[PDB]
């Protein structure tokens, strides 16, 4: 309730934060610990190109790469319980809430 | 495939082999060796381990989930 508007009922974050952290969490569901920096590298050049619209959920490069990673890694859901995946997921969620 | 682990029975395996086999001889499982007046199932299970007459298979799980099967007859027991 603090970090969201109470008129339009949106999160008052920048939209790139929300879409990046969404795609990073989708990637970390299938244990692909490699791609959480690759998504950040994609979004930084995509924001160096042009600012993003909020109405389009996809960023045409993040959802595409994320779909490629998730579809590529199907049996990685039961291999997402190591220390590295849990540490990175904990660090991303905690950095968002802080 | 080729079994690529130790040919020796480890110390943790002979404890559980003797435990399982003495629990079997605690029930009325047939004894493969000659009882020389023993009443303890551990001593009978040690005679069966020494005589290589235990048929149990050790399934050695590797940490990915894979395994490989060893009988106690094809492991090298020591003192």
């Amino acid at each position: 309730l603090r970090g969201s508007c109470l008129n339009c009922h949106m999160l008052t974050c920048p939209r790139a934060v929300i879409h990046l952290l969404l795609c990073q969490l989708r990637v970390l569901e299938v244990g692909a610990l490699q791609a959480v920096y690759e998504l950040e590298r994609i979004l930084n050049r995509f924001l160096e190109e042009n600012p993003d619209p909020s109405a389009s959920e996809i960023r045409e490069e993040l959802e595409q790469y994320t779909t490629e990673i998730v579809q590529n890694n199907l049996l990685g859901s039961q291999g997402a319980h190591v220390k590295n995946v849990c540490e990175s997921k904990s660090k991303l969620i905690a950095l968002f809430w802080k | 495939q080729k079994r690529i682990t130790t040919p020796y029975m480890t110390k943790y395996e002979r404890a559980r082999v003797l435990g399982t086999r003495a629990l079997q001889i605690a029930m009325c499982a047939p004894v493969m060796v000659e009882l020389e007046g023993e009443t303890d199932p551990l001593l009978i299970a040690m005679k069966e381990l020494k005589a290589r007459k235990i048929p149990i298979i050790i399934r050695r799980y590797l940490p990915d989930g894979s395994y490989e099967d060893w009988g106690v007859d094809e492991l090298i027991i020591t003192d």
Binding site: Y37, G79, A80, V82 | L62, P63
Partner: protein, 209 residues
């Protein structure tokens, strides 16, 4: 001044020559064993007068597999380096079709130019070093073990011997000083020969994250 900046330039040339040889680029033995008098013979003395300019010390090493991937090492003139300089360096790289450089600053870059160097594509891999962290080669220290980057055929047989996932292997950061020395991409596995005291040598493996 003089006789101190020549010493600093000699040391940070010798260290980046050792760096370029360790990454696998063609460096001769005389270019590694260059003494300070041979440095005053090849390049000038009095850098304050400008006989060695930091523009004049820009080297171009080439790699031993093929001479298509060669690497610059730039020593920029300005102490604080912004985006205006690295745009010029990328315009120099785009002419000769260079895909990799290495900028040795003397005070650190601006964080905007830092994000710029990250923000270049796989078309331009630009790295940055402080001058102060090149006064000594850190890999010659007694505690730093030997790090060997592994080809993708060796990582495959590694993960096949132990029936292992890359999620399970130990980590080394990509901002680690020896990962920055050997210039290792994220996702590559680094073989490490420890000078053990219980064993003689010990092979461990760490993945760059």
């Amino acid at each position: 001044d003089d006789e101190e900046e020549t010493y600093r330039l000699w040391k940070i040339r010798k260290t980046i020559m050792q760096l370029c040889h360790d990454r696998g680029y063609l460096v001769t033995q005389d270019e590694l064993d260059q003494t300070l008098e041979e440095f005053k013979a090849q390049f000038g003395d009095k850098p304050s007068e400008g006989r060695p300019r930091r523009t004049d010390l820009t080297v171009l090493v080439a790699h031993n597999d093929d001479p298509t991937d060669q690497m610059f090492v730039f020593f920029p003139e300005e102490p604080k380096v912004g985006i205006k300089t690295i745009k010029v360096y990328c315009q120099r790289m785009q002419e000769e079709n260079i895909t990799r450089a290495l900028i040795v600053v003397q005070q650190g870059m601006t964080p905007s130019a830092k994000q710029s160097l990250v923000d270049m594509a796989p078309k331009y891999i630009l790295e940055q070093f402080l001058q102060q962290e090149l006064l000594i080669n850190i890999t010659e220290h007694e505690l730093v073990p030997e790090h060997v980057v592994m080809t993708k055929e060796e990582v495959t047989e590694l993960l096949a011997r132990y029936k292992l996932r890359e999620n399970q292997l130990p980590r080394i950061q990509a901002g680690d000083p020896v990962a920055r020395y050997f210039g290792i991409k994220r996702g590559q596995v680094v073989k490490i020969i420890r000078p053990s005291e219980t064993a003689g040598r010990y092979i461990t493996y760490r993945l760059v994250q």
